[PDB]
Curated annotation (Swiss-Prot):
Domain of life: Eukaryota
Disulphide bonds in the chain: C150-C176
Protein name as it appears in the record: Agrin C-terminal 22 kDa fragment
Residues of the full protein shown: 1882 to 2078 of 2081
Species of origin: Gallus gallus
Ligand binding (Ca(2+)): D51, L68, Q118, D120
Length: 176
């Protein structure tokens, strides 16, 4: 079941099986797009003070960004994502270290600054864009740009995410 996004489509989900302290994050999914800029996924409370970890298309390539409390670190892929062809994306973080693998490229890795190791969230996860966009002039434009393309087989922390009935904001479902 592939879902389509037209640039104004954003779905809200909450972590499946309070204030939680997460030591790790695991994201898998496939996407299809022609976009050079766009927010794919944002996990965090979404507030100015909140920690986060996100996936986005910045200037033609997928990149992973996260701030656990000691400033953000970015991991940028070397694969052009706007081929309009389905492409797999494997992303994970264990404490400070992270890995981003788009397609069959060699995994790009890195560590966020010394300090925080936990992502403090309430379980919120956004797809295609995010409600609280207080970042239009605080991060690259891609992060406040709705995604345009398709997404399928999304797996979060080893658990399959059901794009349609798991959504909470009763969105307008359009398939690819
Ligand atoms: Ca933290």
């Amino acid at each position: 079941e592939a879902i389509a996004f037209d640039g104004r489509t954003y779905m809200e989900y909450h972590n499946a099986v309070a204030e939680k302290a997460l030591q790790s994050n695991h994201f898998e999914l496939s996407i299809k797009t022609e976009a050079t800029q766009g927010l794919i996924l944002w996990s965090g409370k979404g507030l100015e003070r909140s920690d986060y970890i996100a996936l986005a298309i910045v200037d033609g390539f997928v990149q992973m960004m996260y701030d656990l409390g000691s400033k953000p670190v970015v991991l940028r892929s070397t694969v052009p994502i706007n081929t309009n062809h389905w492409t797999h994306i494997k992303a994970y973080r264990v404490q400070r270290e992270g890995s981003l693998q788009v397609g069959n490229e060699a995994p790009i890795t890195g560590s966020s600054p010394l300090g925080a190791t936990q992502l403090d969230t309430d379980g919120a996860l956004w797809l295609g864009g995010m409600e609280r966009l207080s970042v239009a002039h605080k991060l690259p434009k891609a992060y406040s740009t709705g995604f345009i393309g398709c997404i399928r087989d999304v797996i979060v922390d080893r658990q399959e995410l059901h794009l349609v009935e798991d959504a909470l904001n009763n969105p307008t479902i359009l398939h690819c």
